[PDB]
Amino acid sequence: HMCDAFVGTWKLVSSENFDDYMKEVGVGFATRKVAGMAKPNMIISVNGDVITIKSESTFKNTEISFILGQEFDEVTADDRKVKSTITLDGGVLVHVQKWDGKSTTIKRKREDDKLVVECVMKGVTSTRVYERA
């Protein structure tokens, strides 16, 4: 029952400062433009200790499966090869990605009937709001 309120199929409904976030991450122009249009469906499921987060969109389809606190390899939508660790902290999923001596943190929170994603890279934050599909 660890992630019960996160489980389901979610659709992206709003985004703020995502281009800048991507610039800070180091995403290039063409990828930024095309990824920025995307309205992904995020599908979160749990089976025993393994959480799966799928992202389905027009640009790229991504999928990660993981155990909380256990590092894994991830290829991101912008094609970074990163080392990822996802933990639960006070009911918030906290995802850190490490690559090329860089780091970014993505937090996912249930807020009212929405799932809010806040991505941070040094100073720059983006907020992505999903609603149930």
Ligand SMILES: O=C(O)c1cc(-c2ccc(Cl)cc2)c(OCC(F)(F)F)nc1C(F)(F)F
């Ligand atoms: O949750 C998110 O909505 C999300 C979605 C994407 C994303 C997903 C699908 C497409 Cl087609 C394009 C971009 C993403 O791409 C990594 C980047 F931002 F570095 F490009 N990062 C996040 C993040 F940072 F917040 F986890």
